[PDB]
Design a protein around this ligand. Structure first.
Ligand SMILES: [Cl-]
Ligand code: NA
Ligand code: NA
Ligand code: NA
Ligand code: NA
Ligand code: NA
Ligand code: NA
Ligand code: NA
Ligand code: NA
Ligand code: NA
Lengths: 455, 455, 455
């Protein structure tokens, strides 16, 4: 017998289609190769990143713990599996007791002493109604869930390394931009100084030009720190140093990622690890019900042994000293003060908690993918508008610089043009990083980088 | 007889009144109808949000798990409650053993057998010193805490739905403002294009107008994304999709919330689910000391049954095969190597941990309410100043535009007027959102979100 | 007899020296007086902060819980140390059973009886192969780890208080600066208002002047709130209100801290609490392997008592009613269906998990110090540039101010000079706050403020 309820997977408490609106491109429906099946070696096209991810898959300590957890849960299933077989061992025994005359059969105080060397088992529970099998099946699903928890932890690490790599790259572009802009402001300042001395440029013009130089200089120190701090964060995720022999990497103006299909929401239920992790834990709670039910039914037990017993230690292995035992037992609960019902009620509550947790897991994934798809349908337009802002601002600066040196306009115009171009360029870099980070997280949200190659 | 110490609620380690100063309006004193007693249907005035909150209460999976934990702790209480009663069951027994001559009775090797079927209890602990009663009282108290934790989980969710709805509402208003602003920027640019074509407007004027357009173009795509992502976040909190027959919502310029009276700091100890939760945990720890003390006192046990016994399985239920057993036991510990007092010390340490946690819960609650009252006394003036800025910026915009089209001054004044107005209008939307959400959290901070209608 | 494997401390999986580059000062080397040994009384120069940290060390509830946790884990060590010694108690027992004809000694239905009041030990496990000692040593090292966790709890509190204090101080400077700036803008606006009524200032000049005032009015309301809420965040950390008679505090522009040496990364291995905490947890898991190994070896148990026994209750403490029992046992497991191997595998897996967690603690500590040195090597430059910017903006505002009211220039240039200076000054305060925070957090990363005076 097995009293585990028959398992049926809850229905997905989300929409059948991903959201539509001004922010969303057209829904593309089912895909033959879902994002989860696409390798990170395929998804990430930067060969420097591909190597960094490989270093991290081997040296990161968090993912190392995740791997060892699976092992630890397998071990706990191996214990629960062994509870079904008899614990057989050797039992050496000694007894020596003085008893009063009203207890000893002879009628006067006496010492009764006995010894034994026996081989067999003690309190071996026979699993007729599947109490121990249910607990084994609970322990098996918990292991299975931990295996998916590992796969989820890798998809987290992959996305983390990618984001950290791309942040360092964006901040390295911010830094080089500031160096070039400082040098340009400095050169511009030197002409203004030169003009001031000869009495053409005013004192105001000079201090305005001074403001542009000191601002850029303060910005230079910030990104110098941010770059270093981005390096430190990358090293931590790798679990070791940045390798020396790194392949030439790609630039932020190149296509760094492969475009990944959204698929259908229902794809998540078979592909996304932390949804499958939660399902396996729901299956584990279902199995535990079968153990709480078998508590109502008779509990069969057996104690048996064979060996040698004697009244004196020396007379143990002598002839005519053999001994065996057969001690079966059955126990059926009649009256518990509502105790067994509460234990079944409890296991039933634990299943419903797991239903809800599994459902929340689905609803979370839907939200995360939908967010990624809103970035996909808006960042191309935004980047293009920012590119056009940079292009217009540059033309604006060139005319402004020309009209100041000529004496047609004030320095305030050139100052406005200096700031506007510089803030627009810094922004383009940030926007590009946000678009790429969003794409990387969408990949993770669909099933991530568990596979190195495509399945 | 129980050995549970008397309970005394620790003093509230906060000030008797809420803070005063520049950021705080005058304290309101005692509240006739405390915030906790006021319904979210009374607090929230938007009928659409009210409906949406109702949808979240039935569908949100986090709150659902919270509702189930209460039942799981109730069941655990019911288990501990039952263990004060004797467990009555049916025991079937068997014993077949070979014994050598010197251990047997007969003086010669023999096989003795006995069989029994009986009805009764095994090792029933007579709770004389209240060890099991203490463990039941600990369990009941943990259940009572878990009930309070459900109320706290609801006050959180209500605040989360309100914030996610108000956030969406603001970003929608941002989106529309950006759409309108781009429209006026596009017209202005086209007027400049024509003016340049006749030789009035300069090339600089035209490119200044262009940077204004492309900048709004990038803001439009950002708010288009933000709006969509704000909807995804709300749907996750609801636990389902947005309903189809929702009533008309209210605008952000209208009165949205029924501002809640603060009351006195002491109201928190009676009404905030967070604090009441930590008190029940304290009372639960207090009860564990009763079970640790009881271990020093005599332990009373009983094994008692009645039924049938026989040398042969065939003779079990026959006439004259009747049997009973009465086997009471008492154990009083004398030497434990310090085990028992260490267990008691541990029990006493846990209560101190829980006292310290109870006090922190009150200190944290004071901090949250006070921050909410710092916002209340400052946001009135901040929004008045931001409104006045917007009005002044609109007048500044119109004069500068009028002055540019006439040729009496440059385009830089108009560009500056355009940016100041747009920046100021965006910021007003954000300030209103910061103000509203501070009020929403103030309501939760006093423990408000539990009742639908005012009690 | 102990089966605990030899403890070898894993090698540091970090670089032999802290990073170098554009953002870093030269590596100073090994320090005579390490950062961990510097007292917080020495490190924090501000006497108002020293009184506050003292208040927090005795009133903060989370540090109270952390110190009580040490007592709880110590009590847990004592409980398991006691399991090595025999539990001696007084055991009183009764027995009364009816036996049917075939089972009785008389051949007919008889009632047997047995009583006894005794003093002894039941089931005493003689720790021959060190199973119980391994469990005791496991519990010891978890106590030793909790002792280190308390030390980490303090260094965290010390940093949190210092940061909270500095943040309130920086926001007090932001508020004061805004009061000064608002008065300057209002003065300026009024003089424009007087110049407007006389047909010298235009309607454009006046509205520009107005926007500045309303803008400054809104920032005032904001900083009034942030100061209030910053006080509230500090009170929570103190576990108590702010004292009225505090010592005189130093301003943000003073020398507030002593320069703490970085040392070598290999200092952290001996001097950082949470790294040492991780090491004891690893050591504790190493000891648990000794208890898993000793499950394969013989298990000795001993039951021994002395007292009085009788057939009747009345003849208990009578002459010749004395009794004793001596019952040695030895168990050796032979067949387990892999059970003991799985339990040994589990212990070994847990040790491997603690190795990875110990290696991660070192890698994490490396990141935090390296980021702290990157802040050290860049903030001097940033703040120098920002100070020079403030000065240049100051000269700029003064020139722009006179140039307007003399009729030489227009208000827009004055307006822009006002924005630049006010923004410049606000950013200088923020950069000062962040420079100081980084130094505060660096001190904590190296091993923090456990010692009051320098060691
Ligand atoms: Cl309102
Ligand atoms: Na789709
Ligand atoms: Na970092
Ligand atoms: Na999920
Ligand atoms: Na409302
Ligand atoms: Na709950
Ligand atoms: Na949406
Ligand atoms: Na505008
Ligand atoms: Na309700
Ligand atoms: Na100290």
């Amino acid at each position: 017998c097995s009293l585990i309820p028959d398992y049926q997977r809850p229905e997905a408490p989300v929409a059948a289609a991903y959201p539509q609106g001004q922010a969303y491109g057209q829904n593309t429906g089912a895909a033959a190769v879902p994002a989860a099946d696409i390798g990170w070696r395929e998804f990430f096209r930067d060969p420097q990143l591909q190597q960094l991810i490989g270093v991290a898959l081997e040296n990161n300590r968090d993912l190392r713990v995740a791997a060892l957890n699976v092992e630890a849960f397998r071990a706990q299933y191996r214990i629960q599996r062994a509870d079904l077989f008899p614990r057989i061992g050797v039992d050496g025994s000694g007894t020596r007791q003085r008893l009063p005359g009203d207890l000893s059969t002879t009628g006067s105080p006496a010492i009764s002493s006995q010894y034994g060397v026996t081989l067999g088992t003690t309190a071996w529970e026979l699993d007729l109604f599947g109490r121990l099998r249910s607990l084994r099946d609970q322990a098996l699903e918990q292991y299975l869930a931990t295996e998916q928890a590992q796969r989820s932890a890798q998809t987290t690490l992959v996305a983390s390394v990618a984001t950290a790599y791309l942040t360092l790259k964006a901040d390295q572009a911010q830094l080089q931009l500031t160096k070039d802009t400082l040098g340009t402001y400095q050169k511009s300042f030197d002409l203004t100084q030169r003009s001031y001395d000869v009495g053409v440029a005013s004192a105001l013009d000079l201090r305005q030009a001074q403001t542009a130089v000191e601002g850029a200089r303060a910005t230079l120190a910030q990104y110098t720190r941010l770059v270093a701090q981005d390096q430190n964060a990358l090293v931590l995720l790798l679990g070791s140093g940045i390798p020396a022999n790194l392949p030439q990497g790609l630039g932020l103006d190149q296509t760094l990622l492969t475009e990944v299909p959204a698929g259908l929401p229902s794809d998540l239920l078979q592909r996304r690890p932390d949804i499958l992790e939660a399902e396996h834990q729901l299956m584990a709670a279902n199995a535990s019900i079968g153990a709480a039910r078998a508590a109502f039914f008779p509990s069969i037990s057996l104690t048996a042994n064979a060996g040698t017993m004697s009244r004196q230690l020396s007379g143990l292995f002598d002839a005519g000293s053999g001994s065996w035992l057969f001690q079966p037992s059955i126990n059926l609960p009649i009256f518990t003060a509502g105790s067994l019902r509460a234990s079944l009620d409890y296991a039933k509550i634990q299943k419903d908690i797991n239903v809800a947790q599994y459902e929340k897991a689905i609803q979370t994934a839907f939200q995360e993918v939908a967010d990624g798809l809103a970035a996909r349908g808006t960042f191309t337009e935004q980047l293009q508008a920012q590119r056009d802002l940079v292009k217009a601002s540059d033309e604006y600066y060139q005319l402004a610089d020309k009209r100041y040196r000529t004496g047609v306009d004030n320095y305030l115009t050139l100052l406005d043009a200096q700031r506007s171009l510089f803030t627009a360029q810094q922004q383009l870099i940030t926007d590009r990083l946000n678009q790429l980070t969003s794409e990387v997280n969408l990949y993770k949200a669909l099933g991530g980088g568990w596979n190195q190659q495509t399945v």
